[PDB]
Write an enzyme that holds these catalytic residues in place. Sequence first.
Site, PDB file in Angstrom:
ATOM      1  N   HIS B  10     -69.890  44.952 103.748  1.00  0.00           N
ATOM      2  CA  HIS B  10     -68.503  43.957 104.106  1.00  0.00           C
ATOM      3  C   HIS B  10     -69.355  43.206 105.826  1.00  0.00           C
ATOM      4  CE1 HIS B  10     -67.501  45.676 108.322  1.00  0.00           C
ATOM      5  NE2 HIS B  10     -68.198  46.867 107.594  1.00  0.00           N
ATOM      6  N   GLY B  11     -68.489  41.632 105.455  1.00  0.00           N
ATOM      7  CA  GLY B  11     -69.020  41.030 106.282  1.00  0.00           C
ATOM      8  C   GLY B  11     -68.202  40.737 107.452  1.00  0.00           C
ATOM      9  N   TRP B  15     -63.879  43.828 115.543  1.00  0.00           N
ATOM     10  CA  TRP B  15     -65.324  43.994 116.618  1.00  0.00           C
ATOM     11  C   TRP B  15     -65.752  43.887 116.825  1.00  0.00           C
ATOM     12  CZ3 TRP B  15     -62.549  49.918 117.594  1.00  0.00           C
ATOM     13  CH2 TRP B  15     -60.858  49.661 118.173  1.00  0.00           C
ATOM     14  N   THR B  22     -66.911  50.240 116.386  1.00  0.00           N
ATOM     15  CA  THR B  22     -65.888  50.866 114.865  1.00  0.00           C
ATOM     16  C   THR B  22     -65.533  51.728 114.994  1.00  0.00           C
ATOM     17  OG1 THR B  22     -65.808  48.154 114.795  1.00  0.00           O
ATOM     18  CG2 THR B  22     -64.678  49.608 113.276  1.00  0.00           C
ATOM     19  N   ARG B  61     -61.369  46.688 105.829  1.00  0.00           N
ATOM     20  CA  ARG B  61     -62.621  45.570 106.193  1.00  0.00           C
ATOM     21  C   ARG B  61     -63.715  46.060 104.316  1.00  0.00           C
ATOM     22  NH1 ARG B  61     -63.940  49.778 110.415  1.00  0.00           N
ATOM     23  NH2 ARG B  61     -66.076  50.039 110.250  1.00  0.00           N
ATOM     24  N   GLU B  88     -68.257  54.206 107.433  1.00  0.00           N
ATOM     25  CA  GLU B  88     -68.438  53.879 107.621  1.00  0.00           C
ATOM     26  C   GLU B  88     -68.517  55.251 108.753  1.00  0.00           C
ATOM     27  OE1 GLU B  88     -71.206  52.914 109.488  1.00  0.00           O
ATOM     28  OE2 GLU B  88     -70.666  50.829 109.662  1.00  0.00           O
ATOM     29  N   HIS B 181     -69.948  49.437 103.814  1.00  0.00           N
ATOM     30  CA  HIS B 181     -70.249  50.190 105.131  1.00  0.00           C
ATOM     31  C   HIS B 181     -71.974  49.793 105.228  1.00  0.00           C
ATOM     32  CE1 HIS B 181     -66.190  50.058 106.053  1.00  0.00           C
ATOM     33  NE2 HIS B 181     -66.328  50.835 105.242  1.00  0.00           N
TER      34      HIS B 181
END
Lengths: 240, 240
Positions: B10-11, B15, B22, B61, B88, B181
């Site tokens: 993801h972009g 944060w 994050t 996200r 993540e 992620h």
Amino acid sequence: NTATLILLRHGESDWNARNLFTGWVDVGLTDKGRAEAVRSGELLAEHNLLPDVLYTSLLRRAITTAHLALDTADWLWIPVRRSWRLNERHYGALQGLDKAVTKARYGEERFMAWRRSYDTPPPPIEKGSEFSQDADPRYTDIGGGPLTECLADVVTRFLPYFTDVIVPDLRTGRTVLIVAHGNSLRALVKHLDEMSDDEVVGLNVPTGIPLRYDLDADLRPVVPGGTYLDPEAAAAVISQ
Amino acid sequence: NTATLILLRHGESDWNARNLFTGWVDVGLTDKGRAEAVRSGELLAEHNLLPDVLYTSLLRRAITTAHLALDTADWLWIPVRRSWRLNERHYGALQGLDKAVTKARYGEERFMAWRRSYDTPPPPIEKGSEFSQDADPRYTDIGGGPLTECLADVVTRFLPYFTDVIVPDLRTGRTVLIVAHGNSLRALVKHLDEMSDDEVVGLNVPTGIPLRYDLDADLRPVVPGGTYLDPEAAAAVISQ
Ligand SMILES: [Cl-]
Ligand SMILES: [Cl-]
């Protein structure tokens, strides 16, 4: 309740706005359709009614609605399952037509018959034509799908999804959200309130207002016809 | 290839934009993160690489990125499955901190150790604190989840999802899209290219550029390290 079942019909599409018969033609939401999706998400949050699982059709107008609603409620992580069995009725050769062009092609008598009949489908759409889904890869496993449907057909092909996939989720006490279309939601409501063929064609399903069914141990509804999360906004659609 | 496996990180999040650590804190995309999601959808369409199934983390996200990409590619109907195992790395007590505040609390030596170590997790986050996920309902079945992770941990908890859920999909010849992620994608890439512990911490994964693995009969890659769908834009991220 042993189980809670939430029903949401999507809001306005581009073809609703132009008064075109859609069926399985995979059209997008208008801005106002999107705003209804956001609003229905707010209503789910305000009532603290967050589903354990989401069910949708394969049509972008439902899928996007569901996504927008869950995004607004900050509840995007839940499992999702989709099926063609939740699709709107296939409108046959009426897909992409409007009132005036249908009347001229088939006559007023047939147009009236198809609009209100439970049992009489419109004529089949031409295979390979611009608004036929027969070559569409999402329908390969069902041979391209039906070339036209009446409401009776929708009931026949929805029932198996209800008994085999959704009912087991409801038995486990989970809160289930279904985001779909007028006629597929009509098929479900027919089954939950044991409505007759005649009562169901006349059933009104407002857009953008989730409808909460509280189901007992037998999965019969505690409140027949359910309880809209905004009852006053819902009486507004029904009254107009 | 017997199978195609597509990897998308993801972009930019809110944060990332503020340089805050994050982890599992469920933050949103910036506008520029959204534009990367749309762009990656265009890249999937241009290469006619449309997945039969989508896998994501439980973090908005990733989920939103996946939705935006599939929406742009007009491919929203496919099945989706999500798991915490694609999340993540959990950043421990570093969740919600920045470089300067971490350095002041723990010293420069530990901050440097945690940033580059494969094996050394940061300190656990306080239970019930503002950026802990322990009370979060999506993690009930894993006891609220870990209170901190290193990359080694991510590998341990991702591997079972890969072997038990994703591998069977790849064996059936299906095209699989995973939207996740940096560190979870690193865990996967470690496994596909049989990378060593040292090689993997140093692995760069550009945002917003899908990475195509073509896998053979043994599910080993035909091209080690995969082929980015925009190789030149990807050399751009790696070079900076
Ligand atoms: Cl849409
Ligand atoms: Cl987002």
